[model samples]
Target: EKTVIKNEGTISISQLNKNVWVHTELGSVPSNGLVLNTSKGLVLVDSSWDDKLTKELIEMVEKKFQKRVTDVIITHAHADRIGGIKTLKERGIKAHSTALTAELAKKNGYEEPLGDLQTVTNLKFGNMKVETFYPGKGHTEDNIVVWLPQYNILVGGCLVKSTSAKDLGNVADAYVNEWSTSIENVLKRYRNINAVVPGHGEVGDKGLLLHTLDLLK
Candidate 1:
Protein backbone atom coordinates (compact mmCIF):
# COMPACT_ATOMS: atom_id res chain seq x y z
CA GLU A 1 0.00 0.00 0.00
CA LYS A 2 2.87 2.32 0.75
CA THR A 3 4.85 1.53 -2.37
CA VAL A 4 3.83 3.02 -5.76
CA ILE A 5 5.38 3.02 -9.23
CA LYS A 6 4.40 5.83 -11.64
CA ASN A 7 5.33 6.09 -15.30
CA GLU A 8 5.16 9.83 -15.85
CA GLY A 9 3.83 11.55 -18.98
CA THR A 10 0.62 10.75 -20.82
CA ILE A 11 -0.70 7.19 -20.66
CA SER A 12 1.21 5.45 -17.90
CA ILE A 13 0.29 2.46 -15.71
CA SER A 14 1.27 1.88 -12.11
CA GLN A 15 0.85 -1.17 -9.95
CA LEU A 16 -0.67 0.19 -6.75
CA ASN A 17 -0.55 -3.13 -5.01
CA LYS A 18 -0.53 -6.82 -5.79
CA ASN A 19 -3.95 -6.97 -7.41
CA VAL A 20 -4.79 -3.30 -7.91
CA TRP A 21 -3.32 -1.07 -10.61
CA VAL A 22 -3.77 2.55 -11.59
CA HIS A 23 -3.67 3.72 -15.20
CA THR A 24 -3.29 7.43 -15.86
CA GLU A 25 -3.53 9.66 -18.91
CA LEU A 26 -3.59 13.41 -19.53
CA GLY A 27 -6.82 15.34 -20.03
CA SER A 28 -7.80 18.63 -18.35
CA VAL A 29 -5.44 17.25 -15.75
CA PRO A 30 -3.73 13.95 -15.18
CA SER A 31 -6.79 11.71 -14.92
CA ASN A 32 -6.55 8.23 -13.43
CA GLY A 33 -8.53 4.99 -13.44
CA LEU A 34 -8.29 1.67 -11.67
CA VAL A 35 -7.79 -1.80 -13.16
CA LEU A 36 -8.24 -4.79 -10.90
CA ASN A 37 -7.82 -8.47 -11.74
CA THR A 38 -10.69 -10.78 -10.98
CA SER A 39 -11.58 -14.35 -11.76
CA LYS A 40 -14.18 -12.93 -14.17
CA GLY A 41 -11.98 -10.93 -16.50
CA LEU A 42 -10.96 -7.38 -15.52
CA VAL A 43 -13.09 -4.78 -13.76
CA LEU A 44 -12.20 -1.23 -14.81
CA VAL A 45 -13.27 1.53 -12.40
CA ASP A 46 -13.03 4.51 -14.73
CA SER A 47 -12.12 5.23 -18.31
CA SER A 48 -9.05 7.36 -18.80
CA TRP A 49 -8.44 10.65 -20.74
CA ASP A 50 -10.61 9.67 -23.68
CA ASP A 51 -11.55 6.85 -26.04
CA LYS A 52 -8.05 6.41 -27.41
CA LEU A 53 -6.50 6.35 -23.96
CA THR A 54 -9.10 3.98 -22.60
CA LYS A 55 -8.76 1.73 -25.61
CA GLU A 56 -5.00 1.75 -25.21
CA LEU A 57 -5.40 0.85 -21.54
CA ILE A 58 -7.66 -2.06 -22.43
CA GLU A 59 -5.11 -3.23 -24.99
CA MET A 60 -2.37 -3.13 -22.40
CA VAL A 61 -4.47 -5.23 -20.05
CA GLU A 62 -5.36 -7.76 -22.69
CA LYS A 63 -1.77 -8.05 -23.92
CA LYS A 64 -0.07 -8.00 -20.55
CA PHE A 65 -2.63 -9.49 -18.20
CA GLN A 66 -4.42 -11.54 -20.87
CA LYS A 67 -7.89 -10.37 -19.79
CA ARG A 68 -10.56 -8.38 -21.49
CA VAL A 69 -12.48 -5.75 -19.58
CA THR A 70 -15.79 -7.27 -18.58
CA ASP A 71 -17.22 -4.39 -16.59
CA VAL A 72 -16.74 -0.65 -16.07
CA ILE A 73 -17.89 1.61 -13.23
CA ILE A 74 -18.12 5.31 -13.94
CA THR A 75 -17.37 7.37 -10.85
CA HIS A 76 -19.18 10.38 -12.27
CA ALA A 77 -20.35 11.90 -15.50
CA HIS A 78 -17.29 14.07 -16.01
CA ALA A 79 -15.66 13.93 -19.42
CA ASP A 80 -12.39 12.57 -18.11
CA ARG A 81 -14.06 9.73 -16.24
CA ILE A 82 -16.84 8.84 -18.66
CA GLY A 83 -15.15 9.84 -21.88
CA GLY A 84 -14.48 6.22 -22.77
CA ILE A 85 -18.01 4.97 -22.10
CA LYS A 86 -18.83 4.92 -25.79
CA THR A 87 -15.74 2.87 -26.58
CA LEU A 88 -16.46 0.52 -23.71
CA LYS A 89 -20.03 0.04 -24.88
CA GLU A 90 -18.78 -0.57 -28.41
CA ARG A 91 -16.60 -3.34 -27.00
CA GLY A 92 -19.72 -4.84 -25.35
CA ILE A 93 -18.49 -4.21 -21.84
CA LYS A 94 -21.15 -3.47 -19.21
CA ALA A 95 -20.94 -0.06 -17.47
CA HIS A 96 -22.46 0.84 -14.10
CA SER A 97 -23.21 4.19 -12.48
CA THR A 98 -25.75 5.78 -10.19
CA ALA A 99 -29.04 7.09 -11.58
CA LEU A 100 -27.92 10.66 -11.09
CA THR A 101 -24.75 9.94 -12.99
CA ALA A 102 -26.72 8.48 -15.86
CA GLU A 103 -28.99 11.51 -15.86
CA LEU A 104 -26.04 13.87 -15.78
CA ALA A 105 -24.37 12.02 -18.61
CA LYS A 106 -27.49 12.34 -20.69
CA LYS A 107 -27.66 16.06 -19.91
CA ASN A 108 -24.06 16.35 -20.97
CA GLY A 109 -25.00 14.56 -24.20
CA TYR A 110 -22.81 11.52 -23.64
CA GLU A 111 -23.83 7.95 -24.38
CA GLU A 112 -25.97 6.52 -21.60
CA PRO A 113 -24.53 4.00 -19.18
CA LEU A 114 -25.36 0.35 -19.89
CA GLY A 115 -25.48 -1.30 -16.44
CA ASP A 116 -28.04 -1.22 -13.66
CA LEU A 117 -28.52 1.93 -11.56
CA GLN A 118 -28.16 1.67 -7.79
CA THR A 119 -27.14 3.78 -4.83
CA VAL A 120 -25.05 0.86 -3.67
CA THR A 121 -24.13 -2.28 -5.58
CA ASN A 122 -22.29 -5.17 -3.97
CA LEU A 123 -20.87 -7.26 -6.77
CA LYS A 124 -19.03 -10.55 -6.35
CA PHE A 125 -17.07 -11.28 -9.47
CA GLY A 126 -14.84 -14.31 -9.26
CA ASN A 127 -12.86 -14.05 -6.02
CA MET A 128 -13.20 -10.27 -5.81
CA LYS A 129 -15.98 -8.50 -3.98
CA VAL A 130 -16.52 -4.91 -5.10
CA GLU A 131 -18.75 -2.48 -3.25
CA THR A 132 -19.71 0.58 -5.27
CA PHE A 133 -21.52 3.18 -3.23
CA TYR A 134 -22.64 6.81 -3.45
CA PRO A 135 -21.13 7.97 -0.20
CA GLY A 136 -22.32 11.52 -0.79
CA LYS A 137 -21.73 14.42 -3.18
CA GLY A 138 -18.51 16.35 -3.58
CA HIS A 139 -16.68 16.61 -6.89
CA THR A 140 -20.01 16.04 -8.60
CA GLU A 141 -23.56 15.26 -7.62
CA ASP A 142 -23.13 11.72 -8.94
CA ASN A 143 -19.63 10.91 -7.73
CA ILE A 144 -19.08 7.52 -6.06
CA VAL A 145 -16.41 5.30 -4.53
CA VAL A 146 -15.54 1.65 -5.11
CA TRP A 147 -14.29 -0.33 -2.15
CA LEU A 148 -12.21 -3.48 -2.38
CA PRO A 149 -12.56 -4.88 1.10
CA GLN A 150 -10.25 -7.83 0.67
CA TYR A 151 -7.46 -5.56 -0.50
CA ASN A 152 -8.35 -2.74 1.89
CA ILE A 153 -8.24 -0.46 -1.10
CA LEU A 154 -10.63 2.39 -1.82
CA VAL A 155 -11.02 3.71 -5.32
CA GLY A 156 -12.05 7.19 -4.18
CA GLY A 157 -12.57 8.35 -7.73
CA CYS A 158 -12.87 12.12 -8.21
CA LEU A 159 -14.10 12.43 -4.67
CA VAL A 160 -10.55 11.90 -3.37
CA LYS A 161 -7.16 13.31 -4.29
CA SER A 162 -3.49 12.37 -4.50
CA THR A 163 -1.02 13.56 -1.91
CA SER A 164 0.41 16.15 -4.30
CA ALA A 165 -2.92 17.83 -4.89
CA LYS A 166 -3.01 21.37 -3.54
CA ASP A 167 -6.73 21.85 -4.02
CA LEU A 168 -9.71 20.21 -5.61
CA GLY A 169 -8.40 20.51 -9.17
CA ASN A 170 -11.63 21.32 -10.94
CA VAL A 171 -14.66 22.80 -9.28
CA ALA A 172 -16.61 23.61 -12.39
CA ASP A 173 -19.10 20.88 -11.55
CA ALA A 174 -18.24 20.40 -7.91
CA TYR A 175 -20.46 20.84 -4.89
CA VAL A 176 -17.87 22.81 -2.94
CA ASN A 177 -19.91 23.36 0.21
CA GLU A 178 -20.87 19.73 0.60
CA TRP A 179 -17.47 18.31 -0.33
CA SER A 180 -16.10 17.90 3.18
CA THR A 181 -19.21 16.38 4.69
CA SER A 182 -19.49 14.00 1.79
CA ILE A 183 -15.93 12.79 2.35
CA GLU A 184 -16.50 12.65 6.08
CA ASN A 185 -19.31 10.23 5.43
CA VAL A 186 -16.91 8.11 3.41
CA LEU A 187 -14.28 8.21 6.14
CA LYS A 188 -16.85 7.04 8.68
CA ARG A 189 -18.05 4.26 6.38
CA TYR A 190 -14.79 2.59 5.47
CA ARG A 191 -12.06 1.83 7.97
CA ASN A 192 -8.54 0.44 7.67
CA ILE A 193 -7.97 1.56 4.09
CA ASN A 194 -4.48 0.53 3.01
CA ALA A 195 -4.45 2.30 -0.35
CA VAL A 196 -6.45 4.99 -2.16
CA VAL A 197 -6.51 5.59 -5.92
CA PRO A 198 -7.69 9.09 -6.61
CA GLY A 199 -9.02 10.52 -9.87
CA HIS A 200 -5.58 12.12 -10.38
CA GLY A 201 -1.97 12.14 -9.25
CA GLU A 202 0.03 9.49 -7.36
CA VAL A 203 -1.51 6.74 -5.24
CA GLY A 204 -1.01 6.68 -1.51
CA ASP A 205 -2.41 5.43 1.81
CA LYS A 206 -5.33 6.65 3.98
CA GLY A 207 -3.66 10.06 4.32
CA LEU A 208 -4.74 10.84 0.78
CA LEU A 209 -8.32 10.90 1.98
CA LEU A 210 -7.44 13.15 4.90
CA HIS A 211 -5.43 15.37 2.62
CA THR A 212 -8.41 15.75 0.31
CA LEU A 213 -10.60 16.61 3.26
CA ASP A 214 -8.09 19.20 4.32
CA LEU A 215 -8.14 20.69 0.83
CA LEU A 216 -11.89 21.16 1.03
CA LYS A 217 -11.60 22.64 4.51
Candidate 2:
Protein backbone atom coordinates (compact mmCIF):
# COMPACT_ATOMS: atom_id res chain seq x y z
CA GLU A 1 0.00 0.00 0.00
CA LYS A 2 1.30 3.49 -1.03
CA THR A 3 0.56 5.13 2.28
CA VAL A 4 -3.05 6.25 2.10
CA ILE A 5 -3.62 9.98 2.31
CA LYS A 6 -4.82 10.98 5.77
CA ASN A 7 -8.14 12.77 6.05
CA GLU A 8 -10.48 13.43 8.97
CA GLY A 9 -12.11 10.00 8.80
CA THR A 10 -9.41 8.26 6.80
CA ILE A 11 -6.28 6.44 8.05
CA SER A 12 -2.69 6.34 6.83
CA ILE A 13 -0.90 3.01 6.92
CA SER A 14 2.88 3.21 6.90
CA GLN A 15 5.01 0.13 6.76
CA LEU A 16 7.64 0.22 9.48
CA ASN A 17 9.33 -2.94 8.18
CA LYS A 18 7.10 -5.83 7.07
CA ASN A 19 4.88 -7.13 9.86
CA VAL A 20 4.71 -3.99 11.97
CA TRP A 21 2.33 -1.17 10.89
CA VAL A 22 2.21 2.41 12.14
CA HIS A 23 -1.18 4.18 12.08
CA THR A 24 -0.48 7.93 12.53
CA GLU A 25 -2.96 10.78 12.76
CA LEU A 26 -2.63 14.07 10.93
CA GLY A 27 -2.17 17.31 12.83
CA SER A 28 0.09 18.48 15.67
CA VAL A 29 2.02 16.02 17.84
CA PRO A 30 1.20 13.27 15.34
CA SER A 31 -0.95 10.89 17.33
CA ASN A 32 -0.26 7.27 16.40
CA GLY A 33 -1.59 3.80 17.16
CA LEU A 34 -0.12 0.45 16.25
CA VAL A 35 -2.24 -2.52 15.17
CA LEU A 36 -0.82 -6.03 15.12
CA ASN A 37 -3.73 -7.28 12.89
CA THR A 38 -3.36 -10.77 14.23
CA SER A 39 -5.97 -13.55 14.27
CA LYS A 40 -7.34 -12.27 17.56
CA GLY A 41 -8.55 -8.89 16.26
CA LEU A 42 -6.66 -5.56 16.39
CA VAL A 43 -4.35 -5.19 19.33
CA LEU A 44 -4.33 -1.36 19.59
CA VAL A 45 -1.40 0.40 21.20
CA ASP A 46 -1.89 3.95 22.54
CA SER A 47 -4.97 6.15 22.17
CA SER A 48 -4.73 9.40 20.16
CA TRP A 49 -4.68 13.08 21.25
CA ASP A 50 -8.20 14.09 22.30
CA ASP A 51 -11.79 12.95 22.06
CA LYS A 52 -12.12 13.82 18.38
CA LEU A 53 -8.81 12.30 17.36
CA THR A 54 -9.43 9.19 19.45
CA LYS A 55 -12.85 8.64 17.90
CA GLU A 56 -11.29 8.80 14.47
CA LEU A 57 -8.44 6.59 15.65
CA ILE A 58 -10.85 3.87 16.66
CA GLU A 59 -12.85 4.27 13.44
CA MET A 60 -9.70 3.88 11.38
CA VAL A 61 -8.98 0.62 13.15
CA GLU A 62 -12.49 -0.65 12.43
CA LYS A 63 -12.20 0.18 8.74
CA LYS A 64 -8.97 -1.78 8.51
CA PHE A 65 -9.96 -4.75 10.63
CA GLN A 66 -13.70 -4.86 9.94
CA LYS A 67 -14.34 -5.47 13.63
CA ARG A 68 -14.66 -3.53 16.84
CA VAL A 69 -11.58 -2.90 18.98
CA THR A 70 -11.00 -5.95 21.15
CA ASP A 71 -8.03 -4.73 23.14
CA VAL A 72 -6.68 -1.24 23.90
CA ILE A 73 -3.22 -0.73 25.42
CA ILE A 74 -1.74 2.43 26.84
CA THR A 75 2.02 2.90 26.63
CA HIS A 76 1.77 5.32 29.52
CA ALA A 77 -0.57 7.70 31.32
CA HIS A 78 0.22 10.82 29.28
CA ALA A 79 -2.77 12.66 27.77
CA ASP A 80 -1.77 11.96 24.20
CA ARG A 81 -2.14 8.23 24.77
CA ILE A 82 -4.83 8.18 27.43
CA GLY A 83 -6.91 11.29 26.76
CA GLY A 84 -9.67 9.75 24.69
CA ILE A 85 -10.03 6.56 26.62
CA LYS A 86 -13.55 7.42 27.65
CA THR A 87 -14.74 6.80 24.12
CA LEU A 88 -13.38 3.28 24.26
CA LYS A 89 -14.79 2.72 27.70
CA GLU A 90 -18.25 3.85 26.61
CA ARG A 91 -18.12 1.38 23.76
CA GLY A 92 -17.25 -1.48 26.15
CA ILE A 93 -13.80 -1.94 24.74
CA LYS A 94 -11.35 -3.61 27.09
CA ALA A 95 -8.50 -1.19 27.92
CA HIS A 96 -5.20 -2.73 28.97
CA SER A 97 -2.50 -0.78 30.79
CA THR A 98 0.06 -1.14 33.54
CA ALA A 99 -0.95 -0.66 37.17
CA LEU A 100 1.35 2.33 37.66
CA THR A 101 0.04 4.05 34.54
CA ALA A 102 -3.56 3.50 35.66
CA GLU A 103 -2.90 5.01 39.06
CA LEU A 104 -1.29 8.08 37.50
CA ALA A 105 -4.18 8.46 35.09
CA LYS A 106 -6.73 8.32 37.89
CA LYS A 107 -4.75 10.74 40.03
CA ASN A 108 -4.66 13.17 37.10
CA GLY A 109 -8.52 13.35 37.20
CA TYR A 110 -9.26 10.81 34.48
CA GLU A 111 -10.77 7.44 35.37
CA GLU A 112 -8.58 4.37 35.17
CA PRO A 113 -8.50 2.78 31.71
CA LEU A 114 -9.70 -0.52 33.09
CA GLY A 115 -11.89 1.05 35.76
CA ASP A 116 -11.87 0.04 39.46
CA LEU A 117 -14.28 -2.90 39.35
CA GLN A 118 -13.12 -4.54 36.14
CA THR A 119 -10.56 -7.30 35.96
CA VAL A 120 -7.72 -6.17 33.69
CA THR A 121 -4.75 -8.42 33.92
CA ASN A 122 -1.23 -7.90 32.57
CA LEU A 123 -1.10 -9.22 29.02
CA LYS A 124 1.49 -10.10 26.38
CA PHE A 125 0.55 -9.68 22.71
CA GLY A 126 1.70 -10.52 19.16
CA ASN A 127 3.73 -13.41 17.71
CA MET A 128 6.98 -12.61 19.47
CA LYS A 129 5.07 -12.43 22.76
CA VAL A 130 6.87 -9.13 23.48
CA GLU A 131 7.55 -8.91 27.16
CA THR A 132 5.80 -5.94 28.76
CA PHE A 133 8.71 -4.24 30.54
CA TYR A 134 8.65 -1.17 32.84
CA PRO A 135 12.44 -0.65 33.15
CA GLY A 136 11.77 0.91 36.57
CA LYS A 137 10.88 4.54 35.48
CA GLY A 138 11.45 7.35 32.95
CA HIS A 139 9.54 10.20 31.20
CA THR A 140 7.29 9.79 34.21
CA GLU A 141 6.94 7.52 37.22
CA ASP A 142 4.51 5.36 35.21
CA ASN A 143 6.31 4.87 31.91
CA ILE A 144 6.18 1.49 30.13
CA VAL A 145 6.98 -0.14 26.76
CA VAL A 146 5.59 -3.01 24.65
CA TRP A 147 7.96 -5.31 22.79
CA LEU A 148 6.96 -7.40 19.74
CA PRO A 149 8.88 -10.62 20.14
CA GLN A 150 8.52 -11.76 16.52
CA TYR A 151 9.62 -8.49 14.95
CA ASN A 152 11.65 -6.93 17.76
CA ILE A 153 9.37 -3.90 17.59
CA LEU A 154 9.62 -1.97 20.85
CA VAL A 155 7.04 0.70 21.64
CA GLY A 156 9.07 2.67 24.23
CA GLY A 157 6.31 5.22 24.84
CA CYS A 158 7.76 8.69 25.59
CA LEU A 159 11.04 7.40 26.94
CA VAL A 160 12.37 7.08 23.35
CA LYS A 161 12.05 9.50 20.40
CA SER A 162 13.06 9.63 16.72
CA THR A 163 16.39 11.33 17.33
CA SER A 164 18.14 12.70 20.38
CA ALA A 165 16.31 15.86 19.35
CA LYS A 166 16.50 17.88 22.56
CA ASP A 167 12.95 19.25 22.39
CA LEU A 168 12.00 17.09 25.36
CA GLY A 169 8.22 17.09 25.10
CA ASN A 170 6.39 18.02 28.33
CA VAL A 171 9.03 17.17 30.92
CA ALA A 172 7.33 19.48 33.43
CA ASP A 173 7.30 16.84 36.19
CA ALA A 174 10.00 14.54 34.85
CA TYR A 175 12.19 12.54 37.19
CA VAL A 176 15.53 13.51 35.60
CA ASN A 177 17.70 11.27 37.80
CA GLU A 178 15.77 8.10 36.99
CA TRP A 179 14.59 8.99 33.44
CA SER A 180 17.91 8.23 31.75
CA THR A 181 18.56 4.99 33.55
CA SER A 182 15.02 3.84 32.88
CA ILE A 183 15.63 4.19 29.14
CA GLU A 184 18.98 2.45 29.52
CA ASN A 185 17.22 -0.51 31.08
CA VAL A 186 14.80 -0.63 28.16
CA LEU A 187 17.77 -0.70 25.76
CA LYS A 188 19.47 -3.44 27.71
CA ARG A 189 16.32 -5.56 27.73
CA TYR A 190 15.87 -5.49 23.97
CA ARG A 191 19.34 -5.51 22.38
CA ASN A 192 18.20 -6.88 19.02
CA ILE A 193 15.22 -4.56 18.64
CA ASN A 194 14.56 -3.96 14.95
CA ALA A 195 12.43 -0.77 15.06
CA VAL A 196 11.15 1.48 17.81
CA VAL A 197 7.88 3.45 17.58
CA PRO A 198 8.39 6.26 20.03
CA GLY A 199 5.61 8.06 21.87
CA HIS A 200 6.12 10.78 19.22
CA GLY A 201 8.22 11.33 16.05
CA GLU A 202 8.44 9.51 12.73
CA VAL A 203 8.68 5.77 13.33
CA GLY A 204 12.20 4.82 12.39
CA ASP A 205 15.29 3.10 13.85
CA LYS A 206 15.43 1.90 17.42
CA GLY A 207 19.07 3.06 17.61
CA LEU A 208 17.81 6.48 18.69
CA LEU A 209 16.66 4.77 21.87
CA LEU A 210 20.37 4.32 22.51
CA HIS A 211 20.91 8.07 22.10
CA THR A 212 18.51 8.58 24.99
CA LEU A 213 20.35 5.89 26.94
CA ASP A 214 23.66 7.65 26.25
CA LEU A 215 22.26 11.10 27.14
CA LEU A 216 21.34 9.66 30.49
CA LYS A 217 24.67 7.83 30.82
lDDT of 1 by residue, 14-99 (tens): 78666677877887578888888887899888987578878887887777678778988998998888999889889998888888
| CA-lDDT, candidates in order | 0.83, 0.70
TM value for model 2: 0.85
| Model 2 ranges with Cα > 4 A deviation | 1-5, 9-11, 17-19, 26-28, 115-128, 214-217
Model 2: weakest 10-residue lDDT segment is: 115-124
Q: Quick one: best TM-score, which candidate? A: 1
Over 4 Å off, model 1: 1-9
Pairs of colliding residues, candidate 2:
128-149, 128-150
lDDT of 2 by residue, 128-150 (tens): 24456777667777777877777
TM-score of each: 0.92, 0.85
How well does model 1 score by local distance difference test? 0.83
Clashes of each: 0, 2
What RMSD does model 2 have?
A: 3.4
